[PDB]
Amino acid sequence: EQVFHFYWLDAYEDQYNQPGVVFLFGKVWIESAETHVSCCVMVKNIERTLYFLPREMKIDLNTGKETGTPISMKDVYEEFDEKIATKYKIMKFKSKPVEKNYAFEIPDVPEKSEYLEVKYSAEMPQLPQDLKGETFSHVFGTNTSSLELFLMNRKIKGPCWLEVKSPQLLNQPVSWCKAEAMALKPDLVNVIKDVSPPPLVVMAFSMKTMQNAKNHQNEIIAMAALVHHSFALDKAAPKPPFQSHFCVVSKPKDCIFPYAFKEVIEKKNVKVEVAATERTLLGFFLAKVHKIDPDIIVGHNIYGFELEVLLQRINVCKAPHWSKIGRLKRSNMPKLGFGERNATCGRMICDVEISAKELIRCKSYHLSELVQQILKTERVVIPMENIQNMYSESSQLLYLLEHTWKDAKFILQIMCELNVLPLALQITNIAGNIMSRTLMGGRSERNEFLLLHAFYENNYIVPDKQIFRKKAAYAGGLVLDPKVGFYDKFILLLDFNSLYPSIIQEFNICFTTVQRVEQIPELPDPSLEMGILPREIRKLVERRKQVKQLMKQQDLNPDLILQYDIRQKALKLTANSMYGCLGFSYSRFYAKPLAALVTYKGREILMHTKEMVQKMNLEVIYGDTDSIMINTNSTNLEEVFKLGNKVKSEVNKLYKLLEIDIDGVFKSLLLLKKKKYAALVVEPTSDGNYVTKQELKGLDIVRRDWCDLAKDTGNFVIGQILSDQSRDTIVENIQKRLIEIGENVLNGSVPVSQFEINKALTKDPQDYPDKKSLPHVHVALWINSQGGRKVKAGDTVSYVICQDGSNLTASQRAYAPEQLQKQDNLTIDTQYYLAQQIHPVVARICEPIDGIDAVLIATWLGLDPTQFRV
DNA sequence: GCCTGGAGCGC
DNA sequence: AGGCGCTCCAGGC
Numbered sequence: 082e083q084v085f086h087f088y089w090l091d092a093y094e095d096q097y098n099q100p101g102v103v104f105l106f107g108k109v110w111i112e113s114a115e116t117h118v119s120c121c122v123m124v125k126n127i128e129r130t131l132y133f134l135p136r137e138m139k140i141d142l143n144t145g146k147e148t149g150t151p152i153s154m155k156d157v158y159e160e161f162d163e164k165i166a167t168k169y170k171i172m173k174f175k176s177k178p179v180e181k182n183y184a185f186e187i188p189d190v191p192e193k194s195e196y197l198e199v200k201y202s203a204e205m206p207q208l209p210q211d212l213k214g215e216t217f218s219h220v221f222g223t224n225t226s227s228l229e230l231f232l233m234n235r236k237i238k239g240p241c242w243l244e245v246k247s248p249q250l251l252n253q254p255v256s257w258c259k260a261e262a263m264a265l266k267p268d269l270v271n272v273i274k275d276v277s278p279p280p281l282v283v284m285a286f287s288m289k290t291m292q293n294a295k296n297h298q299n300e301i302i303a304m305a306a307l308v309h310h311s312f313a314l315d316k317a318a319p320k321p322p323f324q325s326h327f328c329v330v331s332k333p334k335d336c337i338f339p340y341a342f343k344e345v346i347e348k349k350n351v352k353v354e355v356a357a358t359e360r361t362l363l364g365f366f367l368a369k370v371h372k373i374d375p376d377i378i379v380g381h382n383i384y385g386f387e388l389e390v391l392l393q394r395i396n397v398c399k400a401p402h403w404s405k406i407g408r409l410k411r412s413n414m415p416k417l418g419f420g421e422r423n424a425t426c427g428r429m430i431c432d433v434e435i436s437a438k439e440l441i442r443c444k445s446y447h448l449s450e451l452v453q454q455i456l457k458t459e460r461v462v463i464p465m466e467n468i469q470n471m472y473s474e475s476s477q478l479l480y481l482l483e484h485t486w487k488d489a490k491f492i493l494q495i496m497c498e499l500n501v502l503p504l505a506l507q508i509t510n511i512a513g514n515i516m517s518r519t520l521m522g523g524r525s526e527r528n529e530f531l532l533l534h535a536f537y538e539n540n541y542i543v544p545d546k547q548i549f550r551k552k553a554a555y556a557g558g559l560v561l562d563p564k565v566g567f568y569d570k571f572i573l574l575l576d577f578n579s580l581y582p583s584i585i586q587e588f589n590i591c592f593t594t595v596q597r598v599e600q601i602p603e604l605p606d607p608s609l610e611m612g613i614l615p616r617e618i619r620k621l622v623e624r625r626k627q628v629k630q631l632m633k634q635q636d637l638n639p640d641l642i643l644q645y646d647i648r649q650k651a652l653k654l655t656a657n658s659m660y661g662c663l664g665f666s667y668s669r670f671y672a673k674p675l676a677a678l679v680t681y682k683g684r685e686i687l688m689h690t691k692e693m694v695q696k697m698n699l700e701v702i703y704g705d706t707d708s709i710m711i712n713t714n715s716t717n718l719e720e721v722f723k724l725g726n727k728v729k730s731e732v733n734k735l736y737k738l739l740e741i742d743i744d745g746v747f748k749s750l751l752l753l754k755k756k757k758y759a760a761l762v763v764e765p766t767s768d769g770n771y772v773t774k775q776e777l778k779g780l781d782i783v784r785r786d787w788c789d790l791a792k793d794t795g796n797f798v799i800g801q802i803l804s805d806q807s808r809d810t811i812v813e814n815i816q817k818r819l820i821e822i823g824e825n826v827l828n829g830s831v832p833v834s835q836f837e838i839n840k841a842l843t844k845d846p847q848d849y850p851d852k853k854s855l856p857h858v859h860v861a862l863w864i865n866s867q868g869g870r871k872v873k874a875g876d877t878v879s880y881v882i883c884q885d886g887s888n889l890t891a892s893q894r895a896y897a898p899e900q901l902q903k904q905d906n907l908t909i910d911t912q913y914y915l916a917q918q919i920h921p922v923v924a925r926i927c928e929p930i931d932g933i934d935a936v937l938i939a940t941w942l943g944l945d946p947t948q949f950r951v
Numbered sequence: 952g953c954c955t956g957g958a959g960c961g962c
Numbered sequence: 963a964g965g966c967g968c969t970c971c972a973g974g975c
């Protein structure tokens with residue numbers, strides 16, 4: 082023959098200009114150049130694929146009644162061949178009778194049956210999804226994407242090595258990739274598995290933008306990028322993260338580079354190119370883009386701002402070869418990340434903002450916040466006003482560029498820190514979806530691609546793509562009534578391991594085993610074998626076991642362990658995510674009856690577990706969906722854990738796969754209400770001993786809509802409660818401090834910082850009808866209608882309550898911090914805070930404590946108690 | 952007092 | 963472009 086190997090990373094298509102074709106960009110070894118180069122493979126002839134559902138008896142449309150002659154594959158074949166094919170302009174077409182299974186929303190479809198498969202060019206017309214005929218009642222695949230068909234049929238599951246049999250060269254190059262080939266047909270393409278993945282060429286960039294003096298615009302005057310041509314994903318980030326780097330700067334228009342700048346750059350030997358203009362930077366950049374030809378281009382908030390502005394600034398400055406951004410040669414340049422992903426199609430865009438939004442939690446996900454919390458370092462924020470100045474002296478521009486060179490070094494280390502790539506890879510290789518799509522976030526799609534591959538492989542007719550917070554549509558998890566109170570004696574936290582994924586298998590809940598048509602469907606007959614969905618979850622559970630069982634190995638490749646830990650986490654998020662999409666109204670595999678059955682059993686399973694743990698003379702004090710809080714009443718740790726391993730074993734004993742576990746043990750517990758509670762957690766260390774760490778749940782103290790001053794104050798009180806000290810020593814400590822907090826708010830010693838209450842706007846400040854009494858929206862209209870920047874939906878506004886001298890309600894007395902200090906009439910509303918922030922949280926924390934209460938707390942805070950109740 | 956919805960968390 | 967469960971706080975009548 083003649084075959085070649087290529088590792089793909091991104092797949093693209095243009096169902097409108099080139100139906101039937103799918104472009105795949107990846108990497109290829111060039112033995113002569115001892116290195117992987119980019120590579121584009123063109124796959125032609127991916128034919129539509131439709132299934133026609135035969136009727137029991139033939140029908141006649143002009144009457145809408147039966148005829149009497151049964152149907153056969155010959156019948157249908159003919160009707161299409163004769164009326165259908167001919168009428169919709171179908172020239173060539175091949176068919177064949179096949180047998181397919183189905184288990185979905187479309188009633189009047191047999192679980193199994195014989196369809197007439199039909200394949201014809203993607204170029205020919207595409208039929209009406211609702212078509213019907215003399216011989217057939219329905220027809221699927223009528224709109225199946227070319228990239229779907231290809232991926233499903235070839236059993237491709239995310240990045241992996243492919244074999245292209247009988248490749249063709251191309252005279253006219255269509256991409257910007259070093260290598261290019263063409264595949265004559267979908268089946269010349271074959272997945273291979275015994276091959277390690279190839280390193281990647283990753284480029285980390287950052288940019289600076291300046292608004293112009295006269296005309297309104299966003300001119301990019303600088304750009305930094307770090308580069309690694311060997312950034313592996315089947316192993317640990319590299320040390321260093323980059324191998325080479327480049328800088329570029331340009332004067333906006335009406336400014337000159339300080340003098341001696343050229344010679345100060347030559348002086349300190351920095352790889353920085355001084356660009357004479359905006360176009361000269363854009364063109365210098367695309368030039369580099371194209372030469373380093375990075376598979377993965379990383380940045381900060383890319384699909385939101387940074388990218389939109391890079392492409393529009395190439396449209397304005399009429400830059401040379403815009404697509405050199407992406408990997409495909411193209412002519413027109415779209416605009417608004419759809420229009421954007423496409424501009425970079427063939428290349429993967431890692432956005433450290435959205436990735437983190439997915440791997441951890443923070444108050445705000447903007448770089449500075451992220452660098453700090455993740456790298457444990459401070460990041461200098463340089464305003465756009467200080468910029469024009471910087472250009473006055475050679476030292477300042479050199480700093481604004483050493484600054485942009487840093488961001489690109491936080492982003493590549495932020496990325497490098499969370500293993501966002503080696504993780505993304507696997508989440509994909511597990512669901513078989515598309516990696517670039519993964520890094521773009523979204524669980525729902527990844528689910529779909531996992532069930533499709535599942536259902537194809539198992540000869541199922543998959544549901545056609547549908548071309549188009551809410552009120553709960555069915556019962557969910559169970560919450561046990563909490564036995565409010567403070568606990569001194571040890572508490573046992575027993576919590577089920579993957580309660581939903583397990584429940585799905587344990588009871589064989591699957592599209593293919595549960596009978597359905599609001600009611601809770603009946604569990605499948607234990608006779609049936611494992612449906613597909615369960616069998617899927619099982620592979621996950623099994624492969625995961627295999628890994629956590631490899632981690633126990635000795636004299637093993639050290640770094641491997643970091644890896645095994647990633648796959649394992651992936652093997653879990655996956656599984657636990659399966660449940661969700663089952664209940665999502667827009668998920669291709671909507672199936673409400675199942676999602677219901679799954680939580681129906683969970684409720685049941687959690688109830689019994691409680692009834693049991695009680696028939697065991699142990700008091701259950703709280704339970705949330707699948708967890709159990711037990712009061713051991715023992716102060717003897719060793720004794721707890723045994724009581725622990727005991728309950729476990731008595732429970733596990735009840736299921737084939739379900740398994741509960743000692744999730745943990747609390748030194749003391751403050752249980753306020755459902756979903757709200759504090760706790761000292763037990764973290765054993767060197768045997769015979771342990772150390773304690775405080776864990777808060779649902780407390781106002783955790784939320785964002787409260788001022789520090791209160792959260793702090795609240796925090797301390799919780800701290801003293803779970804504390805060791807006596808009850809009287811605590812009540813005292815609490816009184817002592819509150820008192821002090823009051824007085825310190827009255828003598829304005831409390832940094833206005835604290836009072837600063839924060840909130841976010843779900844709509845733009847102008848979108849509100851009853852705006853006036855909403856302090857966060859009202860303070861925003863000020864800002865928006867006062868200075869430059871403008872607050873819009875999704876943003877948080879900082880305000881504080883003051884004394885207007887307008888006897889208006891507190892709500893209507895919200896001023897930006899800035900405005901409180903810069904004006905003299907505005908004074909902080911000590912009265913508000915002491916009674917609308919501090920006394921409402923501390924009060925609730927103490928509700929169960931004897932010795933502290935509403936009325937007492939007020940008097941302490943220096944408020945008028947008489948106005949309060951117990 | 953009675954009865955909605957967002958926020959925002961928990962799982 | 964995954965569920966439902968529970969405070970709480972507003973708000974309209």
Ligand SMILES: Nc1ccn([C@H]2C[C@H](O)[C@@H](COP(=O)(O)OP(=O)(O)OP(=O)(O)O)O2)c(=O)n1
Pocket residue numbers: 558576577578579580581582657660661706707962965
């Ligand atoms: N973000 C979440 C968290 C939980 N759940 C549902 C499905 C879980 O099966 C069940 C229990 O929540 P857990 O926090 O206990 O998650 P798991 O039980 O699945 O894992 P673990 O074995 O660690 O308890 O609640 C969910 O739908 N979405």
Ligand SMILES: [Co+2]
Pocket residue numbers: 955956
């Ligand atoms: Co409500």
Ligand SMILES: [Co+2]
Pocket residue numbers: 972973
């Ligand atoms: Co009210």
Ligand SMILES: [Mg+2]
Pocket residue numbers: 576577578579580707708
């Ligand atoms: Mg659990």
Ligand SMILES: [Mg+2]
Pocket residue numbers: 576577705706707708962
């Ligand atoms: Mg749980």
